[PDB]
Amino acid sequence: GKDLNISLPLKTKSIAPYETDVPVKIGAAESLFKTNDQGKIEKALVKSYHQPNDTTLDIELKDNIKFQNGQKLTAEKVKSSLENSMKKSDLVKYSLPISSITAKGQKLTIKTNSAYPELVSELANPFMAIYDTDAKSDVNQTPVGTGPYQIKDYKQSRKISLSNFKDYWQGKPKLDHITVTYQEDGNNRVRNLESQKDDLITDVPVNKVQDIENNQNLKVSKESGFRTSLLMYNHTNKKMTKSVREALDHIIDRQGIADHIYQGYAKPATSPFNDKIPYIKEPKLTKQNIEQAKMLLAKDGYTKEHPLKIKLITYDGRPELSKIAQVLQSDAKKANIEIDIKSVDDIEGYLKDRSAWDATMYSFGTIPRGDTGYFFNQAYKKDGAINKGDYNNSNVDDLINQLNHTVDVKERHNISNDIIKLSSRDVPNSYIAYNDQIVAANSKVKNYKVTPEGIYLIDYRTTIE
């Protein structure tokens, strides 16, 4: 009827908003701010805000908003939500250097100790979505949000059931129910869509695009976006030296990968950030050189008789990562590296054991809100939430720390390009491709979001015709 079936990769454990962006993606939760279809920060739950000085953020909330349990969205509710999320998530905590919050009625005041220009931006982060901390349910299973669809049931790591929240503040949502099921294999997601088991899928494997495009019952939406695929190194393993990272960097054939593995739905990467961003000064493009790699590995004493052994992790959720892994393995052998590929079902959990991997295929949304600061803080600082390999360089730290209190946007761009230049010399990770998000749906599904931030999907206008 008006029921939507969605199939996603990257199964969750907790679906608390501070653990995963899935609640924002599927329409259950909303952040104070958002980015619009053109990537600009906008007020969402906020009616007005002011910044009377560089340590004060005054927010007035809209007065017509309720949580899905009927409770009013007030400043005290936003205060308790933000404080809980900071307390429970390192990602949130490190993105929000908030020193204190006061609340009365619909107005809250957020204070910092010093200037943090990216505060408002990070309040648009989906991990900062607002939920009812007083709700009498487990926030890890059925958080209560302000979004158009309330989570009614959660089968852990498998299925999310949502129902229309009729009093949703923007208007009456257009679906009755939504069912979200996790499926890590991209080919399976496509088969599910083709057999109408599901109506809407993300992360379509590039080699299935043509098959879906030929189907008049289906439609494919591609978006160039700001997601980057990479080879992430484990810097806590002493064998993963600069020579080894440089060697592996030169075993990658980025242009070949973009042309043949992504079949043109990607561009070769240099820095974390898509080169279509005008102010980014990219480092030189690394071209595959097996002899150079072989040479570098001689610096650490590796030979055909005594090769470097690398345990490389991968996962199915982003369909092209394991295809890249396969050709890295084949090519690395020519450079006296024996790569063992291990595909895992729960990548975030697996990487927590730093003794269990040397490198990993990975993918990250490196600039979801128009600023490079988020990535540097989460990926290049010790204990940042996506710094799985524990990359840290005090010289890079210093620039990131300076960036964090830099207000002038032109100066931000300059410091950012300095960080890119300096960090690139370490080869903290090998960035492989800026690749398109590809979404496919039954032709009767209308008005879902496929926009460059790669976060949003469902809103109150998404429907079935």
Ligand SMILES: N[C@@H](Cc1c[nH]c[nH+]1)C(=O)O
């Ligand atoms: N950050 C990786 C792994 C992940 C699992 N869940 C969320 N992320 C990716 O998005 O592909």
Ligand SMILES: N[C@@H](Cc1c[nH]c[nH+]1)C(=O)O
């Ligand atoms: N899956 C999203 C969000 C995330 C946070 N941590 C890991 N992933 C990304 O990779 O950008």
Ligand code: NI
């Ligand atoms: Ni991720």
